[PDB]
Design an enzyme around this catalytic site. Sequence first.
Site, mmCIF file in Angstrom:
data_model
loop_
_atom_site.group_PDB
_atom_site.id
_atom_site.type_symbol
_atom_site.label_atom_id
_atom_site.label_comp_id
_atom_site.label_asym_id
_atom_site.label_seq_id
_atom_site.Cartn_x
_atom_site.Cartn_y
_atom_site.Cartn_z
ATOM 1 N N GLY A 172 8.909 1.532 0.502
ATOM 2 C CA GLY A 172 8.172 0.654 -0.391
ATOM 3 C C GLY A 172 8.534 -0.820 -0.230
ATOM 4 O O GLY A 172 7.784 -1.705 -0.654
ATOM 5 N N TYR B 231 -1.235 3.001 -3.710
ATOM 6 C CA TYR B 231 -1.378 3.137 -5.153
ATOM 7 C C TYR B 231 -2.798 3.556 -5.488
ATOM 8 O O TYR B 231 -3.731 2.765 -5.351
ATOM 9 C CB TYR B 231 -1.045 1.824 -5.869
ATOM 10 C CG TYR B 231 0.383 1.356 -5.690
ATOM 11 C CD1 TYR B 231 0.769 0.653 -4.553
ATOM 12 C CD2 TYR B 231 1.345 1.613 -6.661
ATOM 13 C CE1 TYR B 231 2.075 0.224 -4.387
ATOM 14 C CE2 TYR B 231 2.654 1.192 -6.502
ATOM 15 C CZ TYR B 231 3.011 0.497 -5.362
ATOM 16 O OH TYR B 231 4.306 0.072 -5.195
ATOM 17 N N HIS C 260 7.661 -7.241 -14.040
ATOM 18 C CA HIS C 260 8.775 -7.172 -13.102
ATOM 19 C C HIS C 260 8.691 -8.290 -12.088
ATOM 20 O O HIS C 260 7.619 -8.848 -11.874
ATOM 21 C CB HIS C 260 8.779 -5.829 -12.368
ATOM 22 C CG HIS C 260 7.664 -5.689 -11.377
ATOM 23 N ND1 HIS C 260 6.363 -5.425 -11.754
ATOM 24 C CD2 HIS C 260 7.654 -5.777 -10.025
ATOM 25 C CE1 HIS C 260 5.600 -5.360 -10.675
ATOM 26 N NE2 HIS C 260 6.358 -5.566 -9.613
ATOM 27 N N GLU D 130 9.992 -8.561 -7.874
ATOM 28 C CA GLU D 130 10.282 -7.582 -6.823
ATOM 29 C C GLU D 130 11.781 -7.357 -6.725
ATOM 30 O O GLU D 130 12.574 -8.201 -7.159
ATOM 31 C CB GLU D 130 9.730 -8.043 -5.470
ATOM 32 C CG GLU D 130 8.226 -8.306 -5.458
ATOM 33 C CD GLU D 130 7.419 -7.114 -5.953
ATOM 34 O OE1 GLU D 130 7.489 -6.028 -5.333
ATOM 35 O OE2 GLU D 130 6.716 -7.259 -6.970
ATOM 36 N N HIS E 126 5.225 -10.439 -12.830
ATOM 37 C CA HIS E 126 3.835 -10.033 -12.937
ATOM 38 C C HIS E 126 3.694 -8.655 -13.537
ATOM 39 O O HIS E 126 4.626 -7.854 -13.528
ATOM 40 C CB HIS E 126 3.136 -10.076 -11.574
ATOM 41 C CG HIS E 126 3.853 -9.326 -10.497
ATOM 42 N ND1 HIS E 126 4.951 -9.840 -9.841
ATOM 43 C CD2 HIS E 126 3.619 -8.107 -9.950
ATOM 44 C CE1 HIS E 126 5.362 -8.968 -8.933
ATOM 45 N NE2 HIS E 126 4.571 -7.912 -8.978
HETATM 46 O O1 LIG Z 1 -0.794 -2.213 -8.114
HETATM 47 C C1 LIG Z 1 0.332 -2.032 -8.653
HETATM 48 O O2 LIG Z 1 0.627 -0.908 -9.136
HETATM 49 C C2 LIG Z 1 1.338 -3.161 -8.747
HETATM 50 C C3 LIG Z 1 1.634 -3.741 -7.388
HETATM 51 C C4 LIG Z 1 2.738 -4.777 -7.486
HETATM 52 O O3 LIG Z 1 3.459 -4.866 -8.461
HETATM 53 C C5 LIG Z 1 2.927 -5.710 -6.320
HETATM 54 O O4 LIG Z 1 2.127 -5.619 -5.349
HETATM 55 O O5 LIG Z 1 3.867 -6.552 -6.333
HETATM 56 NI NI NI Z 2 5.228 -6.138 -7.934
#
Ligand SMILES: O=C(O)CCC(=O)C(=O)O
Ligand code: NI
Length: 348
Positions: A165, A172, A183, A185, A271
Amino acid sequence: ETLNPSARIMTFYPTMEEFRNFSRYIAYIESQGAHRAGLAKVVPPKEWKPRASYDDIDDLVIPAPIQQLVTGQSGLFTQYNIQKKAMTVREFRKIANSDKYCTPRYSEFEELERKYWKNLTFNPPIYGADVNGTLYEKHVDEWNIGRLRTILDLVEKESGITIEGVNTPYLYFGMWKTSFAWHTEDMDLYSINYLHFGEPKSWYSVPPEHGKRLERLAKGFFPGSAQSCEAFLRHKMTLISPLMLKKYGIPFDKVTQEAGEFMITFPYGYHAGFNHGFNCAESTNFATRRWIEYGKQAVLCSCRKDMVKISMDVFVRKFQPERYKLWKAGKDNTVIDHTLPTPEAAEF
Ligand SMILES: O=C(O)CCC(=O)C(=O)O
Ligand code: NI
Ligand SMILES: [Zn+2]
């Protein structure tokens, strides 16, 4: 402080020629001040496509779908995951488009957004999240989430460590009301997100220069959780409505991602968001030279131990050789300026 001073989410439309060098274009949008919003949208050239057709992934297996249970009130929620039995993309799509789970009717986004926050805790949806895989065709060289060609690959290439990941792609599969909690990253990396097909994905973002304010808010509202990890938001269980953010003066922006569009999140950009209906997105992390300093100061989850942790040693030794000795001693007290673009942006 002069680029993108309002720190609003920016949208870019690269030509095919600009599109071909990924790291260079990230440098570009940062030279435009895109990073200050914490989130940016990139719309690829009309000519570009990651995969010819999507009607052949019907038998793709989602090994661990998650039913998202949400508890809370007054704009503050905690999400609980229940793992469901494996299922195929067909089976998921039929459930998703069933009358029990399908997108409610509405006219404008704000109506749908209100429905999300009003009904978040009812009829727990199922999210086909964290599926190891790619939907890109192997010959796609531009913005291939499987092989972005950034310095993050120093983790795999030099030290032989694969983090699922993080330096490998995730799929997803969403349906209406499936959520991702607030959150940044892991290691406060960048992330990239491509929406392959389906209904939109909506995003909330807090400018990195105000990310500490969101953390204080969260700590105040979940004092129990705060006592257990200093970084409990990394559990990715915490949902906070925009009404609450507005009430407590936390600046944020909203954007809706449509099929065939990229979202980029920036180091220490908080985000959160939700899916409008059946869709499929692909995601991974990446880095620039600017990230290294964020990685070194990232505050990590302390309560678990199997949490994603990346050794910064190789990065400091390669890209900051003059402060490596200092840093190893723990005497590196550099302060991050969130408004500064990555060095690679100088040429712009
Ligand atoms: O689509 C999602 O479940 C979140 C994806 C996400 O948090 C990101 O791409 O940083
Ligand atoms: Ni994210
Ligand atoms: Zn923790």
